[PDB]
Amino acid sequence: GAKPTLQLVYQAVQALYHDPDPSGKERASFWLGELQRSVHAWEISDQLLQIRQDVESCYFAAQTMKMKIQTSFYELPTDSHASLRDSLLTHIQNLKDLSPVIVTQLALAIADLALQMPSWKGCVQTLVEKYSNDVTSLPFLLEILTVLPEEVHSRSLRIGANRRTEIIEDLAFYSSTVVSLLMTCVEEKMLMKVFRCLGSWFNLGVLDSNFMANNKLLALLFEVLQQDKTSSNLHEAASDCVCSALYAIENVETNLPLAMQLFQGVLTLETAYHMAVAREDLDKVLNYCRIFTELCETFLEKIVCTPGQGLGDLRTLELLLICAGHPQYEVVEISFNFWYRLGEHLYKTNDEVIHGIFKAYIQRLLHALARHCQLEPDHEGVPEETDDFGEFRMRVSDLVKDLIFLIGSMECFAQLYSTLKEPPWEVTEAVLFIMAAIAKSVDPENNPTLVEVLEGVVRLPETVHTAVRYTSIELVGEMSEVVDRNPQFLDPVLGYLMKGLAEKPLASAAAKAIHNICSVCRDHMAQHFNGLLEIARSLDSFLLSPEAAVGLLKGTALVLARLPLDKITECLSELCSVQVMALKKLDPTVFLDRLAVIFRHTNPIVHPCQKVIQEIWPVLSETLNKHRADNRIVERCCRCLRFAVRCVGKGSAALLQPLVTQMVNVYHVHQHSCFLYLGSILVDEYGMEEGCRQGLLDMLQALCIPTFQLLEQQNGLQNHPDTVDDLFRLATRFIQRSPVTLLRSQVVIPILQWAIASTTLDHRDANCSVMRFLRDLIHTGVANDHEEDFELRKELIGQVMNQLGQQLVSQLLHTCCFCLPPYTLPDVAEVLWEIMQVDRPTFCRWLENSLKGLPTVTHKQLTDFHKQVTSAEECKQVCWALRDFTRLF
């Protein structure tokens, strides 16, 4: 409301930069921030710009100008545009002398203004033929021209979609005039500004390829890139522009004049590159590598199509490999994207003739990477994945994984290993590293090399560098298969891995490897169960990640299940006992999650687990109602009990009713939706059994009462989308296992009444659950008319549909038009379809009534839409109809 004091805004600025108090300084930023968001920002800006007492005040003013024009342009009327356009132009004139950071801002202002102003016809020409010849006005004139192509793709600047493509072809008619001005402009500090401007103009793809081919500006570009004299800043500007020119080329054949000009141009830079690597200008060596990479990317199609000839000249790849030599890893990593993309293209074409052409380069690159992966000799610990060089090593590992097919896994596996026989720890670790990355890929187990490497790694002494120990363990973990094919190496490998488990910084990696051996070699693992059991007995003593811990228990559980049936029952009991006892002692989260894993993966083929689970049942029971108030803890109990029940084979219907009964009781006081979900799992798994059907129904009816009370609260739907979803998951599971028991029950009516109600809930996943319930429920009086119970299902759907059908249809149509986003339209149409399959004459009535209740759309558009839906032969037409009709709202 109240326009801020002019003395105060300065006061704020003056405060913002210099006020001794930091907090005091801070507030000023807040006040000024709020000022920018105000309508008075426009006025205060324009005044601070013409007054211009400080450099500080102007930046705030210029920034505020820029921000106001991009964020809140709607505030300005049509006639105010010209008034601002002239004001801004005046301001950038009077302020060119000051800091460039002000001008750049102001340049973005004018640029952003021009884009949203349709009135300003030919802003590009109006700008040049007014400022071109002032010479001192050229620095900002190029600034404006530079950022204008950048702002056409600004997220913070929304100006239609059709307008955007109208902005581009306009800039095309005026492409020549700015380029000519740019040509003229060359006739150092003023070169890099010219390059950066042609750069952005290259970017939106508005420069004509043929015109630029025979252009002074394109030749001069490579000239500055050749000279060893050129500054880092100018070198950067030029490198980027060449990369911009290379990138602009969409189709190489269409742009053949420009393409060759650029192709020949960059190739002359090899000497200039070397002049830079000779010195230690890391900025330049990276710059050329960008250009070398951009070339390869632009002409990848030609290199793969016509290797060696013309634009497909393999001199290109030779240059990246030059870059791959450079000892600094930041250089080679740039071309990593291309190298992938190359191997990706090569992978598509199944021609081993094209593979053979590039195999050498790929093997040349790969050896360069193995060098790059080498650690410094003074490196003390395990190799970290979190640091720059560690992320690089991982990134290399991925690239090798993607490119290994062009070299052959086995061929490359044998190669790296033989390089060890002819070396410090650093070189050994890096080789093992790349080997570990492809160890699995070496599919044929026939070859005896793998055994050689296996025994080679396990015979490594503890004395070796802790880093070598680490990546050796990983390698062994990726060679679990070769241990299965050669079961004699089980104890030596397991022995070697147990040692690594003892060492704290090797703990995780060893735990992973043991898990992989467990999963794969579970049959042979018979002997080594006791070893696994005791380290389970003291799992928390090793410093393991939770992942590593869980994996280890999982591995133990898996090999346990393959024991003789008689021995399993006692082994499982003590494998749980460590966590069972720990539960009695006491959140139990970690202990619950550990029991889940054991139950989940202890599934013997046959029940030995029954007596065990029945005994762990009471403590799990007590642990649950103890934590009955905590959603997070009680769901991990549900999850634990879920796999506990599944762990017992046939006969597990015994432990069902005590579990179900407890679920009902705890759900009564606390309505966690995970009890609905767990219920749905029980129905899905035990619903087909006749003996469980009545118990499962009583469950649904018991769980519904608190559920309905919960949902009938104010905005109960909107406040419990998770309860809504799982409820209809539970109901859907009843439909697709034992639909008759549900339909004959009383509870089916309110469930449907809530189903109809929930169709107004905007929740995406919840809406799917209810729509699918509606569809599946109604479909019960349609599906399988050949089987006996059909006429009974027909009748029951009938009574239900008779009672609530009109509301269902009325709400369904209401939802589509006003309540929910279009994503529901298919799910509704499917339900609309199922209704017609039941009683199409009646549906016609129901739909007619719903159309008459429209709270605009003419009468004809209501009549034909009725014809469309009611006389539809495929469900597709219904959905076709809905999408069309819904559009009218």
From Swiss-Prot:
One of the GO biological process terms: protein import into nucleus
Effect recorded for residue 600 to A: In 9Ala; abolished interaction with SRSF1 and CPSF6 without affecting interaction with GTP-bound Ran
Record-listed Phosphoserine modification sites: 72
Tissue specificity annotation: Expressed in skeletal muscle.
Keywords, comma-separated and alphabetical: Acetylation, Cytoplasm, Disease variant, Limb-girdle muscular dystrophy, Nucleus, Phosphoprotein, Protein transport, Transport
Effect caused by changing residue 635 to A: In 9Ala; abolished interaction with SRSF1 and CPSF6 without affecting interaction with GTP-bound Ran
Resulting phenotype, residue 729 to A: Abolished interaction with SRSF1
Entry's Gene Ontology cellular component terms: annulate lamellae; cytoplasm; cytosol; nuclear envelope; nucleoplasm
Effect of residue 726 to A: In 9Ala; abolished interaction with SRSF1 and CPSF6 without affecting interaction with GTP-bound Ran
Assembly information from the UniProt record: Interacts with (GTP-bound) Ran. Interacts with (phosphorylated) SFRS1 and SFRS2; leading to their nuclear import. Interacts with NUP62. Interacts with RBM4. Interacts with CPSF6, promoting its nuclear import. (Microbial infection) Interacts with the HIV-1 pre-integration complex (PIC), which is composed of viral genome, matrix protein, Vpr and integrase. Interacts with HIV-1 integrase protein; the interaction is direct.
Protein's recorded name: Transportin-3
